[PDB]
């Protein structure tokens, strides 16, 4: 879908009718707290529309938006265009955004930092609603086809004449019932989003592409735009209870992967070009590291750049692990110093390090965050 940097266009529209849709379905049972933290949503929607619009105009945007896809049958972004990495990455899909995002958003909100909060739900809704568009589940992008962008403009003209003010059941019933039963937030949201995606990416054959009839886009967008208005209400849902009744879906939970999510220093030349590394300890003394790497240049002057680390043993705790650190090492000759503003880490869906640096790693060194 479309949207403006302002926080205006179809982004815009399908969260702000997330919400009405919330309020309409919202059942007299619903617990006061969940009551009122949709009344601090509300009152920083504005924040819910530009983080909606965002990573589009993000200015450390991947050159073709890869991570603003993700097929839901092959799992990746276009079969493997980021350009996959072996041994050592971990390329971002519209799915694991959605995660990333939802983390940092319950994380900001917890410590009442509502209008950051807000503004990470937002960018976590934009990839689920990318992903419930008929062109980006089937990993069809503009390059491949001249509906796609057609399609999405189509969409925008029209789309007030696509909202919906109700999933069609209240809160106390079945859809929105069944958003709360699992605890473990990722292997929900995975699902959940999956399912969309699939009924995306089969409109696309069915309706969206370039194959069909006008009729066929009509009904494309009325049934797409619905679904993701209808499923960005379910995770406004889940995100209410979540924050509400501080609820941690990492609880007991092994530790398979660790998201990084790095901001660097703004201030001049502190983005660097060295061999950067991850790593961690665990309490019996044994280390695993992983080099920095997605690319297209990272860590530049000013960047957020995001990583993700598969662990070697399965079977590990959170509390098992009893440092991380960062090491740099040069690239040619002369060290390429470096200053990290804040990082954050992030496993089974919790911020587990916030960790404000704002100094300089000039040469060959490491700096623990943990
Ligand atoms: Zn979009």
């Known amino acids: 879908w479309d949207g403006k940097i302002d926080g205006t266009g179809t982004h815009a529209m399908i969260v702000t009718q997330g919400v009405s849709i919330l309020e309409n379905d919202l ?4 617990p006061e707290s969940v009551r009122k ?16 619009t965002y990573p589009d105009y993000d200015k450390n945007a991947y050159d073709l938006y890869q991570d603003h896809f993700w097929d839901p049958d092959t ?60 062109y980006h589940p089937a990993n069809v992008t503009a390059v491949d086809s001249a509906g796609h962008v057609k399609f999405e403009t189509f969409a925008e003209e029209r789309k007030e004449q696509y909202k919906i003010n109700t999933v069609g059941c209240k809160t106390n019933e079945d859809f929105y019932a069944d958003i709360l039963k699992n605890k473990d937030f990722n292997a929900w949201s995975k699902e959940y989003a999956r399912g969309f995606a699939k009924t995306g990416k089969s409109i696309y054959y069915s309706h969206a592409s370039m194959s069909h009839s006008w009729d066929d886009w009509d009904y494309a967008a ?69 080099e920095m790497d997605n690319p297209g240049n990272d860590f530049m002057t000013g960047s957020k750049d995001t990583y993700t680390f598969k662990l070697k043993d399965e079977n590990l705790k959170i509390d098992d692990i009893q440092n991380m650190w960062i090491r740099k ?7 390429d110093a470096y200053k990290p503003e804040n990082i954050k880490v992030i496993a089974n869906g919790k911020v587990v390090v916030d960790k404000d640096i704002n100094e300089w790693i000039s040469g060959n060194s490491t700096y623990n965050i943990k």
């Open 75 to 134: 799992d990746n972004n276009f079969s493997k265009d980021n350009s996959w990495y072996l041994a050592y990455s971990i390329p971002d899909t519209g799915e694991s955004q959605i995660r990333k995002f939802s983390a940092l958003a319950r994380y900001e909100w917890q410590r009442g930092n509502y209008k950051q909060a807000t503004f990470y739900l937002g960018e976590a809704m934009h990839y689920f609603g990318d992903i419930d568009t008929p």
């Open 27 to 30: 059942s007299k049972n619903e």
């Open 222 to 290: 009325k049934v797409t735009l619905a679904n993701s208005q209808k499923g960005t209400a379910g995770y406004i849902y889940r995100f209410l209870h979540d924050v509400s009744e501080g609820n941690d879906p990492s609880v007991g939970k092994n530790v398979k992967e660790l998201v990084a999510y790095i901001s660097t220093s703004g201030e001049k030349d502190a983005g660097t070009d060295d061999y950067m590394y991850f790593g961690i300890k665990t309490k019996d003394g044994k280390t695993q590291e992983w």
């Open 329 to 335: 090492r040069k690239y040619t000759a002369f060290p």
């Open 37 to 52: 933290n949709l009344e601090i949503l509300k009152e920083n929607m504005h924040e819910l529309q530009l983080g909606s």
